[PDB]
Amino acid sequence: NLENKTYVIMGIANKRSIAFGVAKVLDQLGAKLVFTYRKERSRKELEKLLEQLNQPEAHLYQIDVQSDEEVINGFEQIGKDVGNIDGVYHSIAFANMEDLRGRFSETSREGFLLAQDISSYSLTIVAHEAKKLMPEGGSIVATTYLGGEFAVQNYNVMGVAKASLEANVKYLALDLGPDNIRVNAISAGPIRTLSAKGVGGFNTILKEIEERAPLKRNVDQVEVGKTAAYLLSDLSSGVTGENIHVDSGFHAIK
Template identity: 40%
Template structure:
C-alpha cells in the first residue's frame, strides 16, 4: 500500500453488516488511505457476512460487538489497547429500533421501543467516546452516521427522526467537551442509501426516487462517497473541523420539498 493521508493511523469501524453497508464503504476508504483497522461484527449470525470483508480490509482486530450486551463494547476497546495502545479515529454506524415502533407513529411509540432505539443508536456513541478518550492522548476523530430525517420530517422515518436528532446534538456536545484534548466529533449525514438497515423503513424506494429527482446533482450518494468524506474527516487535514453535521447527499438537504 502506498503512503497516504491516514498512514500510521489506527481506526475502529463498528457497523459493517455486509458489502452494502455504509460502514464498509468508510472502512474501504480508511484502508485505501493507509489506516490500520479494527472491525466488529454484531453476532455469530452476522460473522460469516463480515469476516471476509474484515480479511479483505486486513483488519488487525476482529471482534464481536453488540452494544446491548454488557461488556462486549468494553472488550473491543480492551483489545485495541492491548494491540495498539492508542486509537486515532472511530466510526459509529449502528442503529436499531423495534419494528413495531419503527413502522408506527411517533406518538404511538412505546417507552421500551424508544429507549432501545435511543440506547443503540445514540447512547452507544457516548459510551464509545468515553472508552476512546484515554486512547486518544494525541487527539483523534469520532464519527457517527445520521440522516436528513433528524432535521426535517421524512415520511416513514418515524421514531428514528427524534433518535437521530439526539445523535446529532450529542455529537455537538461531545465535540465541545472533548475538543480541549484535540478530539474532534463530526456527524456524517448521507442521503438515502439502500442498506440492510434502510430496507426496514417503509416505502424507502419511493424516498430514494424522490431524493434522486430533487437532488441538485441528480444522483444519489453511495457508500463510497460517504467513505471518502469519512476518510477526510478522520485525517489531519480536517483538524479544525468539529461539531459539524457533514452532508454527503448531492445538496438534497438544501432543497425545499
C-alpha cells in the first residue's frame, strides 16, 4: 500500500513505455506520482495516458538529463510543488541507432559517450538532486538489461552503458546507504517499446526467450511495475545494491 507516498517517474514516452507499466502499478497502489519527460510529444502523450490513472492531477516536468540545470531545477521545483518524495523510478536510456547494430568495435567516441551520459551518468545526478527531497531516506530504482552482464549480439554500446549503470547503482547504494536511501536495478526481459524498435534483431530475441527461458513466455511492463513497487516500498527494506531480473528466468540459464 502506497497511500501518502510520492514517487517521481522518469522516462514515459507512450502507452508502451516500461515506466508507464511502473506508473499503473504504483497508481493502483495509491501513490501520488510526478512525471518527467524530455520531448514535447511525450508531454502530450503523458497528458492522455494520465486519464487512465487516478492521479487527481497532472504533475509534469520537462527534464532532459543531459542538462545539469534542468535536472537541478526540475527536482527543486518538484520539491516546491509536492514536498518530500519517497523515491525515483529511472527509466531513461539512449544510444544512436547506427551504434545498435553491426560491429561494436566501430562505435564512435561521440556515440559511446552519449550512451554513457544519458544511460548511466543521469542516474548519478538524479540521485544527488533527489536526495535533497528525501531527508528521512527513500528508494531509487533504475532499469537495466542482461546485456550489461554478458555480451549480447547487437546491443553493443548500450551493453557497456548498462554495465556502467549497474555499477553506478552499486556505488550509489554504498554512498547513499547511510542516508537511508536504497538504490537498485530491475533487469527487465525484452519488451516491445519505442526504444526497442531501435535495437538490431529485437524480435529474434523475443522468440528465443519464449523458447529457452524457464517460464517459456515473455514479461510485460506491468511485471516490471510489480517488482518496482516492491523495490520502492518498505517490503524491500534491507535490499540495496541489488539487480533483480524480471525476465522469466532467462538470466539463470545458458
